[PDB]
Design a binder for this molecule. Sequence first.
Ligand code: NA
Lengths: 211, 213
Amino acid sequence: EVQLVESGGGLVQPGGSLRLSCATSGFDFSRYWMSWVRQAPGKGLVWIGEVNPDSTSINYTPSLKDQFTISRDNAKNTLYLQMNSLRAEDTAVYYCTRPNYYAMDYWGQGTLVTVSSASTKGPSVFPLAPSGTAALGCLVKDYFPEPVTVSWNSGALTSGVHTFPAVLQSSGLYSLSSVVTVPSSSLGTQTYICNVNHKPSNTKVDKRVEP
Amino acid sequence: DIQMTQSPSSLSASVGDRVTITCRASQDINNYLNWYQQKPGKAPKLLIYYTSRLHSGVPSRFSGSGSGTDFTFTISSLQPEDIATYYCQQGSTLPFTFGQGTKLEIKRTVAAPSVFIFPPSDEQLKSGTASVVCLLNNFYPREAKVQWKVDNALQSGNSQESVTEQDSKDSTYSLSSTLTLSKADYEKHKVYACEVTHQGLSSPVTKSFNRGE
Ligand code: NA
């Protein structure tokens, strides 16, 4: 099936530049127009622009034409977004999308770009251990910028999982917890590992959680 | 640029309800109107295109109507998996523009939380910090009170709460309350407890542990 995977999101200083990439699979990329859409945290969707297959037509929303340059590499089935001199108002999740029919039928999961004068910091990962139903988890502490992704048992465990929205601590660093409820009889039996990924700092941590 | 306005901006409805959302365009866009659904923590998904055409694999309960400047999106019978923010999008003139979204929430019966307490790990303690976590799992309504008790006495420390969005299967919420203390302060007390008050609980529920046990 059609797959759209964005990468490159992280911390950008105000006035800074960054290039995003959208790697595709499951379709002949060279035959399709491609687009970018953004969404500021807790806000609406904003169309950035589109590129036709041979790159002869590139259209942008007028208010953002200075901040963005759209390009593509048909040989690599990759869409790019060159971000220029970003502002605090440009903090958003950036989605690559595929137009079809004037509708966008496929969307990537998006990549978050944070525009801030602070510094990047990887998280510390700690177990939340239990002692009919039991709960366990992982505490993902002191990171910047957002986001962190958490999976359980490399994605084999999904039912009963709750990954909480991050909280901004007094230190200006983020923290979140990911929890899962399981049968209590499985505590001695099954292995539980949370897989934490913080792409902005290239931090990957696998933490075994034992009672 | 064509301005797209949605109404209501937010609504609560019950499973089984017919739900109708409107979209109005600043100028005539003929029938070039699309609807997207965005589930919590997920990317938008195309539901309806060209005002009334269902996209491939979209449930028959979703429909669209209108023309010119006024459009309607209807869910014939609301399902728990329909919890989302819905957006309209005009495709008549460049730049393509979206409505501000309609956040659809679900009203359901009271569900009491299941409560769990977690001590700080020995790994975190070695670093100089102690975070104590109280989990309130799968409850409804969103309103809940969590109180930290240290040695059966009320503690007025640094505690922060986080709440999930409504679950797509049972429309419940979960909440975490995290008490952060320095290792030195964590060691000034023995019993750590979190006391929970919620509409589904006839009397408050306490979960506790003894430091070192
Ligand atoms: Na359900």
